[PDB]
């Protein structure tokens, strides 16, 4: 499998192979589905919209609705203004969202389409019904990755909606980053256990992890409500979880509405979850309750109980920067080694943070690469093997070829059922991760050992 | 006062007026209504359609397994072609190259947009050549490419000289045309002129090609199994599990079999013009489809041993599965279905459903043309639409050295009057029964009205519709991806399909949706 | 592996091989650990106590404390009265439990030791300090299984503690059966979501799934408090979850304190969880909240989304009767087939219930056996294979020899880390089961398929 | 004032008085204190001890892989011997029988208790024979068996005559004696008289047996690898990975090596008396232990080629691991340990810890006797205790046909003077340094006082103690089960053990126990 990948490395400067990212717009689409009664709108050629809706359905095994401007060759000459104006008329009439959240594509960005002007022209024409909203962001796919698209859409939410009206709400805003609905649920559960009022946005819980009830509901029950999105400007503080996905929105809200913010790691593992809980306690004066302390102590108990199977294990990790920074720290906390650590999303922070935690732990000889791909990691593995691989579905090819215990993590995970009901954040998510990691390690040991070395207890 | 009226009701006036033509009801009185097809998508309507790049790179060209396919664009165009379309490939002869597990891109960035991407494209072609030494390289345009000034035709021609293998450019920017269809046409043009007929292989006896067959879920291997058992040489399948060299030698055949009319009819027509090779419409899906196809082939070759072997193989294949066939009919008869796929499968799956006793009430295509709905006889009447007028048309002429008369005109006329579909395709509507409805570019709104009014037992579509339908308590099996199963073509495919369909209908959880407190 | 097991089936009458049960006392020990500040006491030879403590630590990766009478050959002659009287003096002085919960062994039962007399003699001697308690049950290991031992200890709790004082508490008692601490936590969570006051007993949550805090705490935070065990006589109703484990206690409480009871299946899967939620709603007039309804609908969503991998799958199941009855029903609900269904615990109920659900589903050709063992099931598998095996750790040998996807379930699970944090009960537990089942089925498919049949999406 | 006083303080007066003798401190002034050992367990004290059935079936006999071992009892006695003790087995020569993966029992029910269990036992023996055709069948008593009147000796004898293979009964009811120890003795008696010397194999050159070695985690295979490289014939290991036939031919050796003194010394003594075969105490755990053992063996054989190969193999084995050994010492030196195991390993693991720079401050055994603590020289002074007096003693005499002089008397005396432990064992206390404490039958109370007062870096014990110790933030590695690793014996075992130990100490979570919202 992957037979064409050589052991001997010739460094590529132009040919991208098996990327560890996708493009901005699906991140903006995902963020928009975290708004209640929102139809995401893809302003470009319809291929984009179809592909982006499709990956969400493949990952979540759920519907994922979005409209498109359906550019033609004419639009490629005259711009997409006529298309989006037509689209909005059809969307409100046929599908009646409360808000259309527009993002763009490489096509409309190359063309320089002026969304603010189109939207003002829509309003002037009466195309936006009373009580309805159209918002936008710009998501050029030749910049950044899907993480950047998410970040941009959150900025667009703030730009259009957040308002400081002087009516303090006593809440903390939380921007959870590009994490799954189960992670959003777990973060909300922790706020609630701390007894801290909050506004989470975006929030895809109850949108991309919903029930079957026998009736299809185009706009699921979940998502942050428009009125609460407006009210984010009346909050005390914003917690930005994962700088790549969340800081742009947090900083925009500070500038617009004078809401201060604090940047935190995505809360995966011991220190990152601890830092999140401490930030909550420090911001509010609220004590950490026994239930949360119990969960942390159960995680520590599990880390110690399972320790022998973790110490010194070499791990290859690929994924999105916020999650992989925090997961790498957790790998170190477990006594294991982040050996090969890659993201396809550009930016210096990943490099700095990963390098710093490796140095603190005294770990030499790891490879950390920004704008690396799955081809890179496979080549590295051919030169020095690893004990564990953690990535999205596309790692499965390497795992099979190289016989490496494999943990599905991040996005997209398109080949298993129910993963989207499990958090990876918090003490609870950390417990699940340790179980999964040790299960796959032990499964391999027990499949491959000689019969005489087979064990009852482990 | 009918279902068409009910679908149309909620549209705003401008949209209603344009959508009306896309929906027709077949009746005894008027069994062959004209439909509107292959026009622009209405913005904002929630279409299932994709783009020209999908049709060219994702669909027709990608399955060629020993060609390195480079997407010239930002990353998503590449990423979204990484394994989602299930053409299966294996190393040819156990040893040949296979790039199915990879996607290749120039990963365009801001500076490529501002200054052009031709330097990075050249460098990527050379890196791919040096690393992989493939049979050929393809370069596929995406949305920004034309607009930023990149001449990929010139880059490809330069690179091909500098590396010594073929490099083929495809100007399949996604906004071209109105759907995946333009991408088929763009692929076919370059395949015809630059690949087919470039080989040197000696033609074998009883040589056929399967055109417009992409080995989704192993379909092509299953049809080849039966064809080879009868005695045919399967010279090439365009393009499922294909090697580049087999495409180059596609002219070494006596008969082209057209499975997917929409995507490959361009090449079927041009091979007949240039080489004299006749084509028949085939359908390797469903027992009735397969049997009819094999008997039509036998009539074309008119070889006594081939005719006998055809009946022997048919009889043995049917005997092995008849108990399964009987079971599917017992479990499914009387149930109703809708079918909505891209350009072919809404039609080709109908005979199988009919054999199971399932009544197909609704069918449509994302992007098929009037000829796929109404038959090729309407081609002279098709109006040239402004949104596809710039898709290039090429003309071929007989190759003076290679052209041959394969089937003489007298025999051709005889075969046609006997019902053999030589250079013909009657279209989907003809096969549907009276009092059924056709919906071109069916959107979410349309689908919901159909579901509410007709309450079908099952609705076959794709991944974007599947869970929408199933959230409402109705089974939806995917006719693109096969729900990660296959083959669904051929005799073994009928069995695979039928068991999956029965398993879907009889899943117990469908009856558990309402909680006991409600 | 298991090379001595032949294909040709033997109907053994005497030799038990690879049993699907263990003896009563560990079940009583487990129940006793579900009482706060309780030290379990094994009245027999100390080998029993050591073995029984050991299996609990191997399963939970936790301490499991118990004392023993440490019979000698003298006791085998004079009985164990002197031993237990000496034990109680050392237990209260050194270890200071609030309650000693005594169970017996085949030795003390064969000898006919008279616990009520010994306990009355300790009181008379002044060996039981003020405010402290000694209770007992009788747990002959030649009767029943560890499930029966659990049931008997619950009866002992009722016999000694439960009292109707005329002061109605407005609560429902729940006896959760021989289920893990995670299942106890989930059942409590459901009562709390329903807003129904309750007393759960025994309750090993916070006892056999506890945190590491850096100080060893002999009596962990969890366990039902003695005062609440007394107060069970003042409740409105007892729900007995799992007739084998729980009915004896519920019936004893009805006789002693006039608290009515209702018997329910262990709540695994759709109908069994539904029946539990409906019993709660019917008993209290309380409506089912949206959160519980969402969880059920997510389970249905998952059952439908994952259906193709489940339909017609043949399953071999071995374990304890309450859990295996309910799991077998869930297998049917998933569209799969309980092909081989075995418990080591005696009793006709299992046979009747399993046979009846198979008949209702029209399933012919399954083998159901009471007092069957892992050797039986292996022999059956050699004659007609299965697609899935669900059992405790000891099934792993069959799973490897026969190459069957394997789900660890029940007791003891001694070879994985963190399993004891996941419930199997409720809609939440059902979701986890479907994920685990489909994961192991898909893992095998993707490891064994040819390369050309390897898939991205599943 | 001292740690013994601190341990004793909380005991009630009766218990204090009896426990005091089980705890002794070795000092420069009194380096060889007498201990009390092998007495009854105090009821209610929270002991780690097991029963005589464990010692007989679970420990000595179970490892014989081509014998079907039938527990005559209710189900738990059988279930709790299903794989928890990690003796490893493989089919002999790739083809022989192996029942390691199975447990067998009569699954006694109330009817058997009320009416007798002998017919079910007979029927189970016949089912085992007809299904498995093993080399032999064992029948093991449990708590109820004698009390209900079942004569398993008679059942076995009747069955053996019918089926034509040996059937061996063991009256190892759990309440006999005070611990696992009685079960060892009961097993040894029947193995000696009814198994050993029943074979007819031709003795090979340089033949040794390893006695009291059970191949936990592969230990015996690792010993054997090195012994066979030097040129010994490993005639039998009692009983790790043993076939029944090898035990039958245990008399076909020139030297017995005693690894576990407690469990097998009975057979070592009896083989010397009956056959003339000498024994030496051996210790294949730790580099220093192994090296000394191999050098003692070479002294006994006094063969120039064996001696030469002994030194070549020692040098090559050590060279291959010296970098690991250096790392263990670097990472562990200066740390402190306690050891608490059953009857041997508290002692045999000491030299390895000492080589790593670890200071063993506390050691004890569950069930060892005074000779294991103080050395065999104290045997004549050991008082016969009432709770073990009915464990049978058998006597053997020189076999008039098979007895032979292996090492002449004058040479034995010369070898002893030279330090070779022929028919001797110095005991654990001798090896411990001054100021250390020994605790016999250490209970939970005692252990908690030790942990609080001494704050050791690590505490080696078993599964019941492990998590108690680790909940308190102290590493505990299991010296019975090896935490599901091994071999820990032999040269490769030192490396396995050391890496596991370093990995345990340096696990990061130990430093993460206090949450950041607390001091
Ligand atoms: S090529 Fe076409 S949409 Fe003919 S673009 Fe599409 S693998 Fe469909 S109905 Mo996906 S005209 Fe093939 C098709 Fe049919 S990708 Fe496949 S299933 S038979
Ligand atoms: S036989 Fe004994 S308790 Fe010598 S009953 Fe026990 S496999 Fe221990 S210290 Mo478990 S006298 Fe062996 C023993 Fe040592 S079971 Fe093992 S580790 S060396
Ligand atoms: S209609 Fe088709 S798929 Fe769309 S871009 Fe255009 S050729 Fe491509 Fe590629 S990178 Fe992403 S998915 Fe687009 S927004 Fe820029
Ligand atoms: S001290 Fe030892 S292990 Fe204990 S019984 Fe006695 S021989 Fe056996 Fe077997 S069945 Fe269970 S575990 Fe006992 S209580 Fe009856
Ligand atoms: Fe879903
Ligand atoms: Fe633990």
Author numbering:
A (entry chain D), C (entry chain B): 1 to 458
B (entry chain C): 3 to 520
D (entry chain A): 3 to 521
Please quote the paper that reports this structure:
Biological nitrogen fixation is the process of reducing atmos­pheric dinitrogen to a biologically available form, such as ammonia, catalyzed by the enzyme nitrogenase found in certain bacteria and archaea. Nitrogenase is composed of two metalloprotein components, the molybdenum–iron (MoFe) protein and the iron (Fe) protein in the well characterized molybdenum nitrogenase system. The MoFe protein forms a dimer of heterodimers (α2β2) containing two complex metalloclusters in each αβ heterodimer: the [8Fe–7S] P cluster bridging the α-subunit and β-subunit and the [7Fe–Mo–9S–C–homocitrate] FeMo cofactor buried inside the α-subunit. The FeMo cofactor provides the active site for substrate reduction, while the P cluster is believed to serve as a relay for electron transfer from the [4Fe–4S] cluster of the Fe protein to the FeMo cofactor.
